[PDB]
């Protein structure tokens, strides 16, 4: 089938660590490959061992899958709805550079702006829909 890795991301550690890995994994058993490996890597950054090579290769593989998906999805989205272009542009730039944060603000602004007509702006300009029907 198509499922994430069930083994330890940091394969090589003792039973004391294998319990922490499994107890963490049973909570994210229903997540994706990059979503599990992220959480595993976050605590692995405090271990310090050969698992560093698995991190370097993982970050590339994840960034590669995400960037390629985001490129294809963005290409098809360019002929679609305008809000979709904004979301997919954010997803495409972040999928090559996760260290570039703060764009989440402008992505939210655009996503709401495409669904902020003059009707809702005028009804909320006075407050919270002052005596307005369904």
From Swiss-Prot:
Q: Where is this region: Necessary for IgE-binding?
A: 7-24, 31-36, 40-48, 85-102
Q: How does activity depend on temperature?
A: Resistant to heat.
InterPro entries the record matches: ANIS5_cation-bd, SXP/RAL-2_related
Tell me the domain of life.
Answer: Eukaryota
- Expression (tissue specificity): Excretory gland, ventriculus, and the luminal epithelium of the intestine of the larvae.
Q: Where in the cell is it found?
A: Secreted
**What are this entry's molecular-function GO terms?**
IgE binding; IgG binding
Enumerate the residue ranges of region (IgE-binding and IgG4-binding). 109-128
Region spans: IgG4-binding:
31-50, 100-119
Return the Pfam families for the record: ANIS5_cation-bd
Ordered alphabetically, the record's keywords are:
Allergen, IgE-binding protein, IgG-binding protein, Secreted, Signal
Listed GO CC annotations:
extracellular space
Q: How does it assemble?
A: Monomer.
Concerning its family, UniProt says: Belongs to the SXP/RAL-2 family.
Spell out the PANTHER family in the cross-references: DUF148 DOMAIN-CONTAINING PROTEIN-RELATED, PRION-LIKE- Q/N-RICH -DOMAIN-BEARING PROTEIN PROTEIN
What is the designated name of this protein? SXP/RAL-2 family protein Ani s 5
Species, as recorded:
Anisakis simplex (Herring worm)
